[PDB]
Amino acid sequence: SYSYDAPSDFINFSRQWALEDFEIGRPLGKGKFGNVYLAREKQSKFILALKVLFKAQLEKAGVEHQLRREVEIQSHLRHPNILRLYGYFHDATRVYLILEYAPLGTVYRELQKLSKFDEQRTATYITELANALSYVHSKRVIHRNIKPENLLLGSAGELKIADFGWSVHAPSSRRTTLCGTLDYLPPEMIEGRMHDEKVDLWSLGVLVYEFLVGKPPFEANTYQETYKRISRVEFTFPDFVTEGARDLISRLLKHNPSQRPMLREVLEHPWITANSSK
Amino acid sequence: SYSYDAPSDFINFSRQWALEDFEIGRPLGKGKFGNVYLAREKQSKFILALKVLFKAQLEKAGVEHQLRREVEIQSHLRHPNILRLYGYFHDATRVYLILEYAPLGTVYRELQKLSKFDEQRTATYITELANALSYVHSKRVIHRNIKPENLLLGSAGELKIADFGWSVHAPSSRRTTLCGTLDYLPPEMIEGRMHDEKVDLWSLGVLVYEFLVGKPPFEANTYQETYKRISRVEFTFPDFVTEGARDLISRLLKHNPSQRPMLREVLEHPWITANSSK
Ligand SMILES: Nc1ncnc2c1ncn2[C@@H]1O[C@H](COP(=O)(O)OP(=O)(O)NP(=O)(O)O)[C@@H](O)[C@H]1O
Numbered sequence: 001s002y003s004y005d006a007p008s009d010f011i012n013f014s015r016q017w018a019l020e021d022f023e024i025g026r027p028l029g030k031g032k033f034g035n036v037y038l039a040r041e042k043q044s045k046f047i048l049a050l051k052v053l054f055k056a057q058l059e060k061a062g063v064e065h066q067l068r069r070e071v072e073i074q075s076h077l078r079h080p081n082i083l084r085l086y087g088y089f090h091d092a093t094r095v096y097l098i099l100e101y102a103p104l105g106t107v108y109r110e111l112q113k114l115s116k117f118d119e120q121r122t123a124t125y126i127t128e129l130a131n132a133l134s135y136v137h138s139k140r141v142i143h144r145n146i147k148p149e150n151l152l153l154g155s156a157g158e159l160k161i162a163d164f165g166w167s168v169h170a171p172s173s174r175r176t177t178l179c180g181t182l183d184y185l186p187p188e189m190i191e192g193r194m195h196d197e198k199v200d201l202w203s204l205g206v207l208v209y210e211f212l213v214g215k216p217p218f219e220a221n222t223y224q225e226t227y228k229r230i231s232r233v234e235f236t237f238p239d240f241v242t243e244g245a246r247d248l249i250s251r252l253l254k255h256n257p258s259q260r261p262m263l264r265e266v267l268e269h270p271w272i273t274a275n276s277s278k
Numbered sequence: 279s280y281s282y283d284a285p286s287d288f289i290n291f292s293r294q295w296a297l298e299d300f301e302i303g304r305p306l307g308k309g310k311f312g313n314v315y316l317a318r319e320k321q322s323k324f325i326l327a328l329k330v331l332f333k334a335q336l337e338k339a340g341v342e343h344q345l346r347r348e349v350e351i352q353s354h355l356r357h358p359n360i361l362r363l364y365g366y367f368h369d370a371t372r373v374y375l376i377l378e379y380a381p382l383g384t385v386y387r388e389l390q391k392l393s394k395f396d397e398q399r400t401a402t403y404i405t406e407l408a409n410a411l412s413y414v415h416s417k418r419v420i421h422r423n424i425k426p427e428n429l430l431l432g433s434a435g436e437l438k439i440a441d442f443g444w445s446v447h448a449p450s451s452r453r454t455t456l457c458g459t460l461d462y463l464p465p466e467m468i469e470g471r472m473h474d475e476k477v478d479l480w481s482l483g484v485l486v487y488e489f490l491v492g493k494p495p496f497e498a499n500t501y502q503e504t505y506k507r508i509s510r511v512e513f514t515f516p517d518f519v520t521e522g523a524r525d526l527i528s529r530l531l532k533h534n535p536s537q538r539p540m541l542r543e544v545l546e547h548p549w550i551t552a553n554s555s556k
Pocket residue numbers: 028029030031032033036049083099100101102103105106149152162163165
């Protein structure tokens with residue numbers, strides 16, 4: 001049940017994929033269902049990332065259909081600021097995603113090192129991110145999981161959107177995380193609200209805030225308090241956040257999704273154009 | 279922060295409550311934040327249930343405000359088929375709910391013993407449940423957690439609705455269980471859909487099915503499959519479920535909440551009146 005509408009054939013980086021095509025290196029990270037390994041295609045010596053997923057853990061979590069969406073959606077996207085998915089294959093026990101290797105790690109880790117980004121580094125990242133999301137949204141795809149952990153850095157330090165495991169086509173009501181006993185709840189208590197590409201515009205506004213401040217705007221001790229802060233749009237600005245940054249953040253963190261700007265208004269925002277290098 | 283609009287004064291079952299007012303017996307059950315104990319008020323020797331909740335665990339889960347709703351809502355309800363909450367009190371570390379003692383246990387356990395209920399036992403329970411939910415809904419309260427574990431049995435074998443920890447006033451969009459990182463999700467991805475008292479009509483239909491069949495209609499191996507079965511109303515009937523029972527169940531398990539019958543149509547349904555003893 002692992003036949004996707006996505007490439008599975010050998011690629012000459014200089015016949016179906018096989019595990020014997022790859023040399024394996026250090027783990028680049030640990031996912032929930034397996035590790036992502038630094039890898040190399042043997043013939044071309046091309047460096048890639050090999051995401052290994054265990055079929056047993058995929059099925060016990062019932063996530064086999066969202067994996068299909070991740071593979072099919074990401075493999076058909078071609079953008080300099082989006083992580084390539086060159087193809088996939090599977091054997092008896094594992095599924096392998098052949099991913100573009102991002103050498104400079106996650107924006108999450110870079111934010112940990114630098115504590116907070118200056119306005120120019122932030123505006124440049126937001127330009128790259130808005131460009132990539134514009135391309136994603138032109139395909140009617142919602143990423144729905146935009147956050148520093150899922151933003152990788154290319155060899156030139158540019159942003160690469162990664163982790164399309166939650167991506168869907170707009171509009172959608174699909175949930176992302178399900179917890180608790182559902183057996184007795186009606187549909188109106190388990191189904192998510194209808195949402196579209198404006199979801200990623202909100203996440204983009206959260207990123208502008210955390211890039212400049214060093215912490216997310218709705219941070220709280222419990223899930224419930226964070227839930228209320230988000231639902232009621234309860235956040236405040238430290239005094240060092242400039243007026244132009246406060247304007248862009250406030251325009252993006254709108255409870256009404258239709259009131260959030262188009263990505264082109266973000267790219268042309270005065271604070272962005274004044275501080276971005278791209 | 280544990281001052282509720284609910285009784286906290288001593289009651290003569292034959293001055294504020296104190297833990298010294300009660301003799302403690304065996305645990306009647308184990309909740310998520312503490313045990314429910316068989317207890318006895320010393321002066322009157324009146325047998326009750328003492329629900330003990332640890333403030334430290336309540337706050338680390340951020341559930342202090344839903345506890346207020348549970349205490350305030352349940353303590354103002356007076357119905358023979360609803361578990362009384364006589365009052366509450368708290369000390370430095372714990373909150374105590376003084377509950378009516380239900381001698382014959384949960385419907386859950388009775389269903390485990392009998393495997394499945396005959397049509398007459400089922401119809402009688404549904405009559406008692408519909409009567410109690412009619413009273414609850416007359417107060418514009420949604421229980422939102424109707425299931426066999428939360429239905430207790432009085433000394434005469436009658437149903438008693440229990441566990442109002444999820445109860446709210448209609449209409450509502452409050453979630454019941456929150457899981458996963460919310461920090462980057464927009465409101466439309468974390469907020470629940472608007473719902474009202476029709477929620478409990480769906481749960482009632484699930485109960486009719488499980489009472490007669492012995493298993494819930496949307497049972498599945500994963501949360502995701504169960505989610506899809508509920509959202510798409512995917513269930514089938516074993517051949518022994520009679521035509522009248524199939525009619526009542528199908529009328530209640532409507533995806534559109536407004537298409538579900540009033541509780542009075544349930545109480546007057548031909549299958550109910552033909553088989554209920556109440
Ligand atoms: N192409 C890549 N290049 C470099 N590092 C990568 C790449 N893909 C993944 N990683 C690293 O591996 C980690 C886990 O990958 P990820 O795709 O997020 O797994 P996941 O299970 O789908 N999501 P997560 O729960 O965060 O692990 C990431 O946080 C990165 O640090």
